[PDB]
Write a protein that binds this ligand. Sequence first.
Ligand SMILES: O=P(O)(O)OC[C@H]1O[C@](O)(COP(=O)(O)O)[C@@H](O)[C@@H]1O
Ligand SMILES: O=P(O)(O)OC[C@H]1O[C@](O)(COP(=O)(O)O)[C@@H](O)[C@@H]1O
Ligand SMILES: O=P(O)(O)OC[C@H]1O[C@](O)(COP(=O)(O)O)[C@@H](O)[C@@H]1O
Ligand SMILES: [Mg+2]
Ligand SMILES: [Mg+2]
Ligand SMILES: [Mg+2]
Ligand SMILES: [Mg+2]
Lengths: 518, 518, 521
Amino acid sequence: QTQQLHAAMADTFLEHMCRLDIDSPPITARNTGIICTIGPASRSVETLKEMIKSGMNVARLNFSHGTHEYHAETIKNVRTATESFASDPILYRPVAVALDTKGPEIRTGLIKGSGTAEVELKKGATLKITLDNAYMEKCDENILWLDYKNICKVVEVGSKIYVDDGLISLQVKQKGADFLVTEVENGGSLGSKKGVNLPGAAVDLPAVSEKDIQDLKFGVEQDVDMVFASFIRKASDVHEVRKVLGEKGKNIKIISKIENHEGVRRFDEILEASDGIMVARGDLGIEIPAEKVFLAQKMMIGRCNRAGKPVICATQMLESMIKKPRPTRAEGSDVANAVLDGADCIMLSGETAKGDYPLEAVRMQHLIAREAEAAIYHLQLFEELRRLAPITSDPTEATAVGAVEASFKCCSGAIIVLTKSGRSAHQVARYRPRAPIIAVTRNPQTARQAHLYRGIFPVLCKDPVQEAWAEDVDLRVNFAMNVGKARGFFKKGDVVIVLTGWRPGSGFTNTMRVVPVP
Amino acid sequence: QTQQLHAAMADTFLEHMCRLDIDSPPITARNTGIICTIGPASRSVETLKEMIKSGMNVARLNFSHGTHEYHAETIKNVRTATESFASDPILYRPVAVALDTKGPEIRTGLIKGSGTAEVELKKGATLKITLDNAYMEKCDENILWLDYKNICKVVEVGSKIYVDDGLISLQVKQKGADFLVTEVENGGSLGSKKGVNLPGAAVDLPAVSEKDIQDLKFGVEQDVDMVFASFIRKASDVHEVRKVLGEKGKNIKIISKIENHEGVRRFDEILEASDGIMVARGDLGIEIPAEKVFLAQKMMIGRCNRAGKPVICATQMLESMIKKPRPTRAEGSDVANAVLDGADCIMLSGETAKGDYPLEAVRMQHLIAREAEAAIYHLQLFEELRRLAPITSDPTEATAVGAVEASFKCCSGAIIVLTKSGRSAHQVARYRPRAPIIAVTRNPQTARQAHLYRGIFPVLCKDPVQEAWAEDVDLRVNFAMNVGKARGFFKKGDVVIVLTGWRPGSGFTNTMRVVPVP
Amino acid sequence: IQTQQLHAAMADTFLEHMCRLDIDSPPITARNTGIICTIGPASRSVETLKEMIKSGMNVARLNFSHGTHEYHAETIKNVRTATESFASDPILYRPVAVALDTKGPEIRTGLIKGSGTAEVELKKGATLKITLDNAYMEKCDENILWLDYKNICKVVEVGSKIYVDDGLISLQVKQKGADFLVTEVENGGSLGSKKGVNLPGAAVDLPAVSEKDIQDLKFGVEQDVDMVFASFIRKASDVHEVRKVLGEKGKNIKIISKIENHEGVRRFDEILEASDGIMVARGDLGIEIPAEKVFLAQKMMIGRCNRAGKPVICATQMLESMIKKPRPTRAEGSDVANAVLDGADCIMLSGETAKGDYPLEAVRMQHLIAREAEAAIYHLQLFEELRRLAPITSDPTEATAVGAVEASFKCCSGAIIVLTKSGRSAHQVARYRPRAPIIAVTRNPQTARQAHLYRGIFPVLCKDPVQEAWAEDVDLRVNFAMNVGKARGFFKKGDVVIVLTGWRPGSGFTNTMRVVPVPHH
Ligand SMILES: O=P(O)(O)OC[C@H]1O[C@](O)(COP(=O)(O)O)[C@@H](O)[C@@H]1O
Ligand SMILES: O=P(O)(O)OC[C@H]1O[C@](O)(COP(=O)(O)O)[C@@H](O)[C@@H]1O
Ligand SMILES: O=P(O)(O)OC[C@H]1O[C@](O)(COP(=O)(O)O)[C@@H](O)[C@@H]1O
Ligand SMILES: [Mg+2]
Ligand SMILES: [Mg+2]
Ligand SMILES: [Mg+2]
Ligand SMILES: [Mg+2]
């Protein structure tokens, strides 16, 4: 038996688990998109071809560091690598580009002289915090400076303050107008220009930094497909970013990054305003107890699945592959679970940008995602989504459910959807069929953006439009049939689902057909 | 709110019940077919028009009694009444004809002298059963004769014996090779040529009687649409009936009537060989304890639903309306529960054939079935059917499920299916949508036979094919659109599901579209 | 080859459950659904009542529609005589309860011109004037019809239907004065005298209890009935009225509200809350609302009663044909099964036992079907569903009951034995609907009788004096139930059973569940 089918039949979740089989090989398609952060270790065209081949679907650009000219080159290279395969449209896999903003931060000043010197903080000692600028350059173990002018307004006696990536931990014992008197809870080495998190606080830093405003305008100019907006806390934040990309970039998918408590508390309003979500586990698990992170991940992927909006699963998934060519069992497990949890993307940071093994990381993510995709309990997952599906008399939605049910009934090798905007394909994906969704689009941006949705395989028709709209439709169907055939998703005989519309232009998708592969 | 929708939403069966609402009116469509036995009280053309109008869909002819000339006239009249409405194909309802065989029997002899005289059986008296032929003509209250040579082999001391349609009740007190000595439990008037059931005993009479052979040949000649084959006990039996209708009548649906223990015990093999099933509660509740009947009914409707084959629910459903113009609460309840149980047909016997109130019986069945159809727990019913659906790579099946899912998603006003053989419509019905299935067919037999399946509204296109196959398809779709409109199943604006094929001829139905009503 | 429909109880889907019901899977010997028989001409004799009890009667209904105090007093005397005839052996003694069903408020017409036996003929489409003016009481023709409901005008609009003689005749109001109505005949028929009137869809403002009712109820107090079926309950204030009337001296009598019209259904919630139980009065009900809609109301009501853990009764015409015939119609058989499957506590017999030719055959038939249907329930889901809709509470008694019921499912327990003073503990077990019979052991006779009102409680009345050590007194009552169960054939030595006790004497301390093998005692 194959593709974990015996397990997909089980009546109980428990029997489902009990029946997972290591000798049941997956289908060839892989549904979870893979996002790789590009950096020193992966910027070369020659390398990027190898990434795409290994399964990269999105390129992340981390505006934490690096200048415009530097990033512009990364993008130019990603593009070069991608179009290298454009010469055969059957096999060409689009690659999307993503601009991840630095976001607002709270940084400390320099330690006494050189930014290279450190001071030693003792569990229990007093540590005064000034905002007075005199102290910017000379930070010792008695006085520490911040660039968050308004820290006093947003903290109470008793609040924790986390310094250098939540290594050092302070607690506020007294609050003036200008200063704070803290006690060290967690000792350690204090350095220069280190980053500060205010756990629990409603931090009032603007939605976008001045750097961000400019970094974003650049992304518009460079024509990125999506932005990962950092440190989204409230929906007004998302609205800021939207305003900033403004008209010229009104089609760029804004993906809100949930990095602290306020973000979690206000996730609902946020999700509403966002195109998607990234569960930013790194920053998040500095702001909230680490043991609580899986809760937040599961809550978020859950609600994103309910709302049919893309969710990303980020940070440290294959961390050890920065140094080693194979991952830890926990890393293997982390990735499987994100997939089973029902995440759209999975992401690689260090592992691809700086690590010794970028390719090994991508292939590993590819391998696990496939195995985990077969291991889903679609029986229940489908039943559940269907039961929570709002009543709508929108034909597109009705067609999608019909299609997805049909695909379950006939172990369909794929659901083929003609889509101009991607909307139709999204509607199919939101129901999470086991079968890959081949989305056939003439719109390249649609092709790239589609990766953000579990199971959509974007496929870009480069032919001119044919005279009769009928034959043009048939042509695009036939294209997908060829793509599917060639990529080994199905052979002559197998059955497939095809979704078409009744008239040209967007949102007329309403025709579902069950077709045997020619 | 309408159509018991608030109740259809409930997460539990219990909440579902708790939420059934007497102020939530049904839609106008009624899905459960209604089978009326035609007889003295209903044979007139003038009456039959009124039956059709009231909701009769099949005419049952009981070959228990009546000659060929008699039945031939019933059929002539049914036909006359039906075609009376043929002048407007939008409103014309097809009517099927069904031949219900007499089947093998065990009969008694004549009472002392004229077969017009009777005897009295006294609770507690002795009643000898002979097979000795001396007694054939002279049966008194001391000695009773049977024509079933093999009774003694198949009955033990303690067995019950039912005489005259389980009116009189005997228990065997001593058993020889040649005779039985019984005690009367239920007193009553013993007549001539009265029928006998040996409850629990496995009666070995041949599958088809001599009369049956001939009655069946007649049904072939008369062009009936289905046969209700009596006293089906094993699959061999069904095979006999099929052989007898043979080639000339290979298209007539055989519906096996389960009338005794062996029939229930062997239901599986039977169902497999049959086109459908009738739960013959009268006979059945003479052969098995009456308190056990609802078990058998529920088991059989259940397994017929599982197999997607039509089940009928017969006998005494509105019994009191033989004498009275309104039914008892228990009768009302019986009918609702048949529908809730998931029966295709419901049936009337006495109530339409002999009763004082044939029309009131039909209208009553119509009224209840509608209310009960809304009261079904489709959420679970659908979930269950889907989970127990074989995985199949037949396109038609995949299209049907998709169509039914779609219809649930959009509160579809109807699922419109173009079908030549009826197969496609059956496949949609087997999934039990809330929405009516309008089947559009040019084949009149298909039209009539369709009534045997929950929710199919057969609609007969009498026009020739013209011009392009496409526009012929559109034409038939449009016909159904008009039928639906006129019968008040939906208005302009409402959304409907339409099933077509990709090519002419049977099979190939594989196109589902979600269309707003013009 | 299996028993008690076990293979079917295992099924993962409702559909598979149905598909697996088996006519060769015989039930256990216990029967859980209580059976209520109306006593009348055909069943009032002591000699007959012994045979009824034997056959499975658990409650005796008295219909105050008809019959005088002296008459009913005698029926009760006899029921009691028949019952205590078996009191000589407490192991085999079955308690029988007594129930007073009130006549309730009515709307009656006057006498047809001259003899109260003579009739008029009403033609579809004719005009029919309705007066309340008393001049017309004695002389009712086909043009003018009198009612005794002085307030009809206030409670009906132009367009309202009026149903005369048990919804045989049907009028629609065309004009409404201060004093009169002008109606049109929709349903023709023969109009008689003193015939009953229903106002479908009206909020009928007749008092909750009639003057007759007040008195009939006071009688029930005096006669020491266990429950009252209050007729024509419409709003909760109605139930409060009945309670007020039974008042203090009768504060322990269970009031069971009878739902017989629209307002009753519309307001069922408030009503159920104020009632001890409910009767689905299908006859009257299906005159007030379209008959085709009644199964909706029945199913809604039994449903919500199950949710609330309050007793529900299913009434009227369940085995109607057995007034004249010794066996029922397939639809009657089916009706009874479905009431049980629907999850009704009691089933009822009216005509069938009171006036019919075959009272005993009706009782035995109800007994037979209920047993079969009880095995046919889908306990898996029924239990899952009740548990999921159970509020979280910190009440030990509830925790013990669920535990008990789950344990009984686990071990195919032959019975759940509960020592109960008020019945409350047994009710709490029953509200979860175990397959196993609940033997409730009580020294309180009223508790014994009232217990019948709940699916699956088998009341068993300990007549012994209290034993010195409270422990051994507890053991004694457990042992009693063990003996009863043995003798009634509910289990044998070896079988396993669940026993519920408390930690201290007096009510509401039940918190001990044990799993005990049946002894060689
Ligand atoms: O994916 P979207 O934006 O909903 O648009 C889907 C549209 O694509 C089609 O299937 C074909 O696209 P064209 O308009 O480019 O012919 C339409 O028939 C349909 O309405
Ligand atoms: O040959 P026709 O009458 O045009 O048939 C066309 C339609 O009938 C179908 O054959 C229906 O299938 P069935 O007859 O098997 O039910 C389809 O291929 C198509 O939708
Ligand atoms: O010895 P007693 O007072 O009869 O009570 C025996 C046990 O049954 C209970 O009375 C339960 O009775 P209730 O159902 O009336 O609460 C316990 O509280 C007690 O332990
Ligand atoms: Mg960050
Ligand atoms: Mg027969
Ligand atoms: Mg199963
Ligand atoms: Mg009444």
